[PDB]
Design an enzyme around this catalytic site. Sequence first.
Site, short mmCIF file in Angstrom:
data_model
loop_
_atom_site.label_atom_id
_atom_site.label_comp_id
_atom_site.label_asym_id
_atom_site.label_seq_id
_atom_site.Cartn_x
_atom_site.Cartn_y
_atom_site.Cartn_z
N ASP A 60 1.03 -1.22 0.05
CA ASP A 60 -0.09 -0.01 0.08
C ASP A 60 0.82 1.06 -0.23
OD1 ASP A 60 -2.15 1.97 0.21
OD2 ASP A 60 -1.98 1.58 2.53
N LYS A 61 0.38 2.31 -0.47
CA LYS A 61 1.05 3.82 -0.44
C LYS A 61 1.17 4.40 0.77
CE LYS A 61 -0.49 7.26 -2.59
NZ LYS A 61 -0.37 8.25 -1.50
N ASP A 91 -1.73 -1.18 5.61
CA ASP A 91 -2.48 -1.01 6.60
C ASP A 91 -3.82 -0.78 6.56
OD1 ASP A 91 -2.15 1.55 5.37
OD2 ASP A 91 -2.23 2.49 7.47
N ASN A 137 -8.34 -1.80 3.56
CA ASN A 137 -8.22 -1.86 2.30
C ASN A 137 -7.37 -2.96 1.57
OD1 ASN A 137 -8.69 -0.64 -0.21
ND2 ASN A 137 -6.54 0.23 -0.44
N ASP A 138 -6.32 -3.09 2.42
CA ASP A 138 -5.12 -4.20 2.20
C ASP A 138 -5.45 -5.49 2.55
OD1 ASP A 138 -3.76 -1.79 0.92
OD2 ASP A 138 -3.23 -1.34 3.19
#
Lengths: 1035, 328
Positions: free
Chosen positions: A379-380, A763, A766-767
Amino acid sequence: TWQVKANDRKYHEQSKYANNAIKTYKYNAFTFIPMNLFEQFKRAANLYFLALLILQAVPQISTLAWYTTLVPLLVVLGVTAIKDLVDDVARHKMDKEINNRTCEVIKDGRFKVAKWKEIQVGDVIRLKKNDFVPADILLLSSSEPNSLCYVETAELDGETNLKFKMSLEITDQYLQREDTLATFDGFIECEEPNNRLDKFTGTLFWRNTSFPLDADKILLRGCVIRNTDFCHGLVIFAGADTKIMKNSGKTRFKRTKIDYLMNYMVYTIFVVLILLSAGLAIGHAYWEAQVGNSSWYLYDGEDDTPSYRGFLIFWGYIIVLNTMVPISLYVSVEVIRLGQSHFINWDLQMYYAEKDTPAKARTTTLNEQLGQIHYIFSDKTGTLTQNIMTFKKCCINGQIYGDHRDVDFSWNTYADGKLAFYDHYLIEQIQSGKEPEVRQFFFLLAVCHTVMVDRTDGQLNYQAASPDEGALVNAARNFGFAFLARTQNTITISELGTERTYNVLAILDFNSDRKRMSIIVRTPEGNIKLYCKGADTVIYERLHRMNPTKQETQDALDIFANETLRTLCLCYKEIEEKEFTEWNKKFMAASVASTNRDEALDKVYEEIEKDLILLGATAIEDKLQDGVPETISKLAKADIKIWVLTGDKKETAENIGFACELLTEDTTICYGEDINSLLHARMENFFPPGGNRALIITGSWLNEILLEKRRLEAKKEQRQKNFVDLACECSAVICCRVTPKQKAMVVDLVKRYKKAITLAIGDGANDVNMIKTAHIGVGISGQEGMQAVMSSDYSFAQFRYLQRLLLVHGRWSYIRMCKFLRYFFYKNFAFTLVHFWYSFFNGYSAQTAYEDWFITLYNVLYTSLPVLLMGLLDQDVSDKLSLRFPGLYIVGQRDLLFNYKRFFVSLLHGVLTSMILFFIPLGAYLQTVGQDGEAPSDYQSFAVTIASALVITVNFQIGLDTSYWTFVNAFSIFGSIALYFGIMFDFTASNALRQPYIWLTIILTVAVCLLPVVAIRFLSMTIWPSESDKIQKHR
Amino acid sequence: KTRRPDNTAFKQQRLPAWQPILTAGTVLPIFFIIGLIFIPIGIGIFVTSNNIREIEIDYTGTEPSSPCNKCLSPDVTPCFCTINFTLEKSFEGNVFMYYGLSNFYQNHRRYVKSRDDSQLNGDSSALLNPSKECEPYRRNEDKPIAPCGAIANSMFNDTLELFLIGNDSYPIPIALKKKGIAWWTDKNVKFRNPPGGDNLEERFKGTTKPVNWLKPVYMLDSDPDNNGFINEDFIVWMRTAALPTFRKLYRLIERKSDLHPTLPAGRYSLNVTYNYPVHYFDGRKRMILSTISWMGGKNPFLGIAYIAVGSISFLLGVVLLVINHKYR
Ligand SMILES: CCCCCCCC/C=C\CCCCCCCC(=O)O[C@@H](COC(=O)CCCCCCCCCCCCCCC)COP(=O)([O-])OCC[N+](C)(C)C
Ligand SMILES: *[C@@H]1O[C@H](CO)[C@@H](O[C@@H]2O[C@H](CO)[C@@H](O[C@@H]3O[C@H](CO)[C@@H](O)[C@H](O)[C@@H]3O)[C@H](O)[C@H]2NC(C)=O)[C@H](O)[C@H]1NC(C)=O
Ligand SMILES: *[C@@H]1O[C@H](CO)[C@@H](O)[C@H](O)[C@H]1NC(C)=O
Ligand SMILES: *[C@@H]1O[C@H](CO)[C@@H](O)[C@H](O)[C@H]1NC(C)=O
Ligand SMILES: [Mg+2]
């Protein structure tokens, strides 16, 4: 076609519609015990040990006690059952918490409480501020005007910025009151439930008219309402049809590649074991036919034909040679895995000081796979970044500021303290006020925006849909210009502690194509100011010729661009009184729909923002976690490819790509449109993007590329294959605007079409899908929800701690595992095959060459501790050298320490060692050992010589294997040998070891077994030194 | 999450340790010192073994044209067999008299287990209740077999007598001791008669002899010390061998009081009573006479094993030394 009737409890009760309770657990209070079927069948060794337990139960065919195998068997199954019981029990506590979340529902007459379970399709609900949405609802009304609601979809995409959502106009002006909602009877024919988030096709049939619906009107389940006192809606999808729950995957039981390797390399031992026992059984049938029948001393009654006698020992040789696949291997691996996992928890270099959150290995079974990682899907925001978007520099007027030249922020009572601004020239200039352009710059930041005030408990908190705007307003507040509040028609701003209210009369909208926004604010004195803010490219196209600071600001933009800081030019205007009055009448005429309202608005918008004056540009820093740029290059040297799967928009995802150095000036960006030409070109015909080296694809373009009859499936598989090959050859791939399921789809794509071992890190909710899909799942701590942490195998707060997980804990865990398995298979093949060689000298009658006790305690006391400490305390190179030399990670990615070649070499070593351990004594006992009244050459003394030579040989082989000789390692290796001789010297068999010939034979069988190993090992490293050997040699 | 992990050597994977590298300065010595120690020991074993006189007579009589074939078909149960052998070199010191058996699988699973260890220890509970382990010879017709099991049943029961053919042609009997031919532990710990009484007859009441034995375990030997389960010949037999070809101690020829050798060189004739049949399974009974050596017995294989291993290790280090030199 989905059909929803409002407040009709029994519309479909007359299966398709699901109640709004969720389930993520896998086991009930009864069907947990049948979990054995997922342990027994998946791992053949578990089945084989069950066969031995059944095989040793029947006395008709038995050569060992069946209690000695049940106890290890329960441990092997017991630990994995208790490990999976706590994992599922944890999933029951979280599911209960979600289900027991309270809400409000239109029951018969009024709004009364109803938990999330009680919500169902077509059930009107009311939601308050900072309350979770229970199901995919249709917004019907809100406490703020125009029935407008802002909802934080922190779980659909891991972003804290608020999302715009608008209700239908017809429902806006009727369903405001509670009473009208109760009598509301609206019929909706919407699309069937699906995993798509940004698209909704449907209609609302009501009042003899159909109103089309869109994703703006539909709130989703994994969202929180904000900046609105309350809102109303009716559920459309519920429970498992909710788009958040359809964007989720199963909790598969994750197994290591080594565990999969042992499956195919334990089938081999079964085939050999069957062939050996069947081969010896046929030999005994012939032996009993010729020598056994005429041997009167062997007569025992119960006449069995020689074929039957051979049949009986075929099983008799299964128990004798059962240790070829020892049950102790799968009992010791539990200790190795548990001990290795606890080193991650205890690591002080992965302990985050200020949050006080050490790492946590939440799944101990996957420790050795951290040395196998081929890809990382990260994730970004929150993982690479801190979710903090601060304001760093500003080129107000012509001079650049915020360069540490020569803050307390006490002079203004509104200073929140978030800003860490260091320069003092700006502070002095603002208070002094010797340059009015400084005041106008920050006043603009508190004017031209859509930020919203909270004023919750006296705190002037800001929430905004654009994170950049929120940082600017927060930045403006710290410098005195505080955004106090705003109503529909006027805006209030506090300038240097002085109240000041403006009556806004127009707010130009912000659009992605527009790339800018503006606001016409009428000063109380009477002046009209068209404050504008937008991207540098579009802004500079609309400046007045008088502007002398264009070049100087342009130079500043380059400096900010080099530092990877977003920039937005600021401007105003001095529109005349009569000038705007004519335009205002024109602007009001443009508000109506007319034909499209786009060209009418787009046209008039252009002439508004002409002939401007430039103040400067801001520098918004999207802060990265400490050590992220060092991490990505450190893991890049380990031949690991890092992909960024993010829910942020393309520009935000691209910008962080340059900040992290995933993308550089060398990389040329391949966007979604560019790729589609390549994939279509290959269809009508390695990929050129191997030279482009970068890939930025929106989630919308993934659907087109994925395209999500027999001939159609053929294109589906080929189209998926083409993309992965193209995507895998790029240095960096950034997938933006991807739904939570599209994150796991790409992980599945790589796993299926490359057989790569993938790590998913992130985190938030979403992931979770990709954390549950990848081979290894890592959950960054910090999220209050603790949803990626709880579904991840490992969890630590920072991103830079991924260096130690892979290069230290994962590199060693692979080396220690492979050394453990290869030796453990060696020490038992050497130990158990002596019964095979002795078969030729005892009529193939399945008589063990060792005493009965030595059979039981060989893997308990005599060879158990040395290998366990090698599986926990073996380091080829120190931790510093592991991180200083990332290239050593390639050893595990390529499967060099454990293969079929390396497995059979251990069998070959074990077979020859057994051959030597039996046939060197055989020469010394065939004719004469030191013989007198008190002499060996018994069977007991023959068994003692092989056992003594076997114990010393294997305990000397581990001594060669352990390259890290801790005092415990030395004690265990010499203690196991000392313990073996201590046991059999009264703390019969002690008579054999008290003679020279027995010891001379034991000294020989030990050396003949070990000296070829020393020569082979020495030659192997000298001729072909490994990478670790070179560093050790040059250490 | 939780508090700071404790800082300790084990947990932080920083335990003090020595990293051993197989440097050429260490492997090369252990290939030369080993190759230098095993050769002198290999010569010491080989030279001493060849200095042990040994004569081994194979008197099974399977091959015709031998003066012992008459006992392969013993129409009359007591069959006496005589074979002549010559001692070229006089035996010195104590001389041990063994008996050998070839192709006699005493290590068979069905045979090795076929005994009751508890009964041999003098377990009165198992004296009249032998275990299932010695099933085929648990009871003869109604009452139990005292030495139950196939191991005790198939005992070697030939009688061997040594006669020296003196210069007067009158055979001189040679003293042979039947005591102290078993382990000290075996006489006094492992094997014991049933407790109680003074005469062995009453102790073994209600227990039949093994089916193959001619006489029961009452009177295996005249001396009370050497009869019962504590009989030397019975104990030596039950001490199962490891391989089909074995030899078990039978008698001792202690040092003669006079200075002359115990068995002076000359013509010798062995007077053996053929009782044990082995020709059915192609067995080969043998008598072995051996002389005691200070360093154990006569083992040539270990001698050539050290000369081979001592030489092979020396060559490997030289090859390793040469290979190291090229890659130095
Ligand atoms: C100084 C002197 C040292 C030496 C003496 C003391 C050493 C003791 C220390 C460590 C070794 C402890 C013994 C474990 C043996 C491994 C399992 C095993 O081999 O199963 C055996 C039975 O085993 C059992 O019946 C008991 C198993 C209990 C499980 C205990 C877990 C290990 C704890 C670890 C604690 C770590 C502590 C870490 C501390 C930092 C049988 O296995 P098998 O023969 O392969 O089966 C084939 C035949 N079969 C199919 C018919 C059965
Ligand atoms: C020395 O030991 C041998 C065993 O190797 C003895 O030979 C065995 O003698 C028993 C009887 O004493 C035989 O058992 C049965 O004998 C009856 C006759 O009473 C006969 O009808 C049965 O068929 C059966 O043979 C046994 O068969 C026999 N051994 C063999 C291989 O046939 C021998 O008697 C012992 N001699 C002395 C002096 O102890
Ligand atoms: C063996 O010796 C005996 C008695 O000494 C004698 O009768 C017999 O002929 C001898 N046999 C041979 C082959 O010399
Ligand atoms: C051998 O022993 C038997 C039995 O004691 C005896 O009768 C015989 O005379 C002895 N000598 C022989 C057979 O030459
Ligand atoms: Mg995130």
